[PDB]
Amino acid sequence: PGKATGKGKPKWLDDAGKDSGAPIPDRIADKLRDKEFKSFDDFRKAVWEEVSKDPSKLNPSNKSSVSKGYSPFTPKNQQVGGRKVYELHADKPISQGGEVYDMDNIRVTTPKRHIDIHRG
Amino acid sequence: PGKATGKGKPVGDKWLDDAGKDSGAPIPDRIADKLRDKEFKSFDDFRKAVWEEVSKDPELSKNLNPSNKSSVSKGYSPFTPKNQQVGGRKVYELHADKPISQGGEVYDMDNIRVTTPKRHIDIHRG
Ligand SMILES: [Zn+2]
Ligand SMILES: [Zn+2]
């Protein structure tokens, strides 16, 4: 069990397909900061509810997805195998053993990008 | 475009049971030897080769349930136990132990491991 820290930074999702991904925006950072979380999808289910309700809004199927706490589908050429959505990526392995959800470290990436980061 | 190199490890039946612990399960040595010095255009095509070769191997496929057999026959990764799945990530994932692909130019089958989405996120830091 762990909790969320950090400030994130001010589509941003068009950036998700290169470099280290996109940052967790400040407003979302502000809303999750200090919340304890049982597991990794619990934290991820919190992040995406936040994109929806923050008018950063996403085609109809994508707006519906995030509203229920699902990552939105990436473009076809950015998906890989069964991975069709945006993924949360730790820029460094510093989760302090899954005790921290450092929202300055955590980034948003396409599957293609995220695999290319860790290697491919 | 990148080429496969490597060797992998001898594994038994139940090799996938180890995919949710430590650094994941090794590519089996028989698989690596079928794939060595092959060229793959994309990471997907390498992933597809790995799983098509799994389906063509009695001892490596035999613990696989009927659903996962159908998956691997087509080059798709097999589904993990439910408690190893995370969000839309439901099938085993190929993982680089170290970031040593040389910009995608190699698939090092000593470095590449088979993990569950749960373990995989944990390795990189959840
Ligand atoms: Zn990552
Ligand atoms: Zn990995």
Curated annotation (Swiss-Prot), chain B:
Biased composition (Basic and acidic residues): 10-21
Cysteine disulfide links: none
Coiled-coil parts of chain: none
Binding positions for Zn(2+) per the UniProt entry: 95, 120, 124
Biased composition, class Low complexity, residue ranges: 61-74
Region (Disordered): 55-87
Similarity annotation: Belongs to the colicin/pyosin nuclease family.
Task of the protein: This plasmid-coded bactericidal protein is an endonuclease active on both single- and double-stranded DNA but with undefined specificity.
Name of this chain's protein: Colicin-E9
Organism: Escherichia coli
Range covered out of full length: 456 to 581 of 582
